[PDB]
Amino acid sequence: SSQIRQNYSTEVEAAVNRLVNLYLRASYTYLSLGFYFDRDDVALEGVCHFFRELAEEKREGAERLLKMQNQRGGRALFQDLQKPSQDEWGTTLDAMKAAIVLEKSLNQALLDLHALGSAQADPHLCDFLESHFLDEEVKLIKKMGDHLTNIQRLVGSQAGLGEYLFERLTLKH
Amino acid sequence: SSQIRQNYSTEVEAAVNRLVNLYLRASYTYLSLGFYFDRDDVALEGVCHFFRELAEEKREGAERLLKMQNQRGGRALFQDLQKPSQDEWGTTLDAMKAAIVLEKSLNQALLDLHALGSAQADPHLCDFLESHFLDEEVKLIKKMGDHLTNIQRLVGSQAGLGEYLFERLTLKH
Amino acid sequence: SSQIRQNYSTEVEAAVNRLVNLYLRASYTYLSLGFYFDRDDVALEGVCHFFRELAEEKREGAERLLKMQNQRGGRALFQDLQKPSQDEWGTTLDAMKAAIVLEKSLNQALLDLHALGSAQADPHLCDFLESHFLDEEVKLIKKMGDHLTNIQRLVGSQAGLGEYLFERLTLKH
Amino acid sequence: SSQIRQNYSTEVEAAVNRLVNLYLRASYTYLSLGFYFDRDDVALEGVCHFFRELAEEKREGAERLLKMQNQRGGRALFQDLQKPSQDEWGTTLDAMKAAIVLEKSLNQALLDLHALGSAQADPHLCDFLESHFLDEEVKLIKKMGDHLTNIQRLVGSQAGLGEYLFERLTLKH
Numbered sequence A, B, C, D: 001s002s003q004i005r006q007n008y009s010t011e012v013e014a015a016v017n018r019l020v021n022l023y024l025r026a027s028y029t030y031l032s033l034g035f036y037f038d039r040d041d042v043a044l045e046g047v048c049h050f051f052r053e054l055a056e057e058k059r060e061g062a063e064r065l066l067k068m069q070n071q072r073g074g075r076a077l078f079q080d081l082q083k084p085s086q087d088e089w090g091t092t093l094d095a096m097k098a099a100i101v102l103e104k105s106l107n108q109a110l111l112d113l114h115a116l117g118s119a120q121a122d123p124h125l126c127d128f129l130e131s132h133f134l135d136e137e138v139k140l141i142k143k144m145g146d147h148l149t150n151i152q153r154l155v156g157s158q159a160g161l162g163e164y165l166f167e168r169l170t171l172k173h
């Protein structure tokens, strides 16, 4: 009903609101992951910083989707944000596995939205996802896969020592 | 089977390896074109530099495809590189015609890979080709068409003199 | 038959073309080694960078040989480039052993060409190899031997941990 | 008989004095070539500058040989300098052909001196020629071959016009 709305389906408008909820939920999961690694009995600063930076990136993604929703004449609708799936995240290896599962779920939601845009002949939506989300997700998932391989190679050798070395020598602090 | 691989078909993975082979073969053809124009009995420096710069551009294209293959969780496979189609490349006109035929063949391979990505609903692949290859190829083919027109206009007038003037006044040296 | 050719045997001209093929084959082997270490299930960035830099160095060596071939009035001839000897390169230790075998084979080809130049009384060729290839090869082989010793000392202690430490603390990233 | 002379044969000492005479004769030939192109009825400034720069390079070569003669404890002996082979040098094409014949004669004299040094087991002499003469000569002869090819391609088309264009667009002025 908006004065500007053109070629923007109700199906895509609703799917964009659901994707905003998924990105904010992911940002909240990363806030929990980051503060868990800042616990005095965990104390892996580089791991905390890696996840806190991802919490910011996911919030930025949600904000970009909200700006686009308004640019197209859709109406942002917010839903409750489910708490993260765990209260304690285990080792750096467990946390990095949970993060890659979370990113693959966001990536699948982006791919599903792109397919909906293609089905609705909405090229601005496809361009938007391609330009600001799809490549960023593939690059992040590759970086996480690289980190998992390095953590596994390290903790297979000597668990405690390996986790410390990965946080000191790979992660930023 | 990769931990990161998502929505990346075996058909696209294989086609990406074939495209890497085509770009490296093109880079090798440009190395041969460039050194032919550096022969003492050919001696057209600007022509040598034009083709050596294209050899670098094609190698860079292959490297970008290899980085993408790893980012998606595909596995790079290298095949023998066929030698260039000629040992001697004739005049600047003959060489520029061979170059435009080579570029149109690379462009067709990019278009075929884009169509495969569309058929496999792989938008990251389509975005990747659109962002880093399709426009660069159209711009290069246009530049080569412009060069062919200028060389033809020159060598139709006076062959030897025309080739020297094109190398001196159009090509970088 | 060239207007400039002087004291440049057909035996040396052909051996220079074969050496160009060997350097380009080595450059291709290093491209494969580098991208293997960039796989998400290998993920040793410093190792990838070490081999990608060597791919560039070998391509530069081939280009220097081609420039010399033209300076002497010889004619560059290109042959098919055989693919690298492996598709997967194992651990950093296995890869560094394959690299030193490859470099010793290039070094032997340089020594054989120098002996041919001496037999053909071609001092410009001997000076060219001495000035731009022989010392560079001895320095590279020594660096690779040093790396092999460090990797062995590390992976004999704890394989996974040792490989990570070598990539982090010796190789550039 | 010198206090410093060591491993320096009388054969090499005499051949070095003859090579100094050849380089000074070449410098004198280039002085004549340069001033011929400065005649008001020839008037090709870029050609004059190319040959005057070569007259300087050949004089510098003779000075380097004289310094080496004294460093080894040999005794410089100077002989009459024969005048250049022509008083008038024809076209730029004729002059560039005479220059390449002159350079190939200097190159052959360098190669003969290197072979004498090898026969007399005089590695300082071989290194001296390799470091300061052999590569410079090969590079100059290649440049002259490139110039001959360009002049021929130009004057085959239209003699007067081609010579002007080569002097304006290839040679420095």
Ligand SMILES: [Cl-]
Residues within 6 Å of the ligand: A008, A009, A010, A011
């Ligand atoms: Cl609708």
Ligand SMILES: [Cl-]
Residues within 6 Å of the ligand: A082, A083
């Ligand atoms: Cl919940």
Ligand SMILES: [Cl-]
Residues within 6 Å of the ligand: B008, B009, B010, B011
């Ligand atoms: Cl598949």
Ligand SMILES: [Cl-]
Residues within 6 Å of the ligand: B082, B083, C080
């Ligand atoms: Cl072939």
Ligand SMILES: [Cl-]
Residues within 6 Å of the ligand: C008, C009, C010, C011
């Ligand atoms: Cl021969």
Ligand SMILES: [Cl-]
Residues within 6 Å of the ligand: B080, C082, C083
């Ligand atoms: Cl093979």
Ligand SMILES: [Cl-]
Residues within 6 Å of the ligand: D008, D009, D010, D011
């Ligand atoms: Cl003696």
Ligand SMILES: [Cl-]
Residues within 6 Å of the ligand: D082, D083
């Ligand atoms: Cl005389």
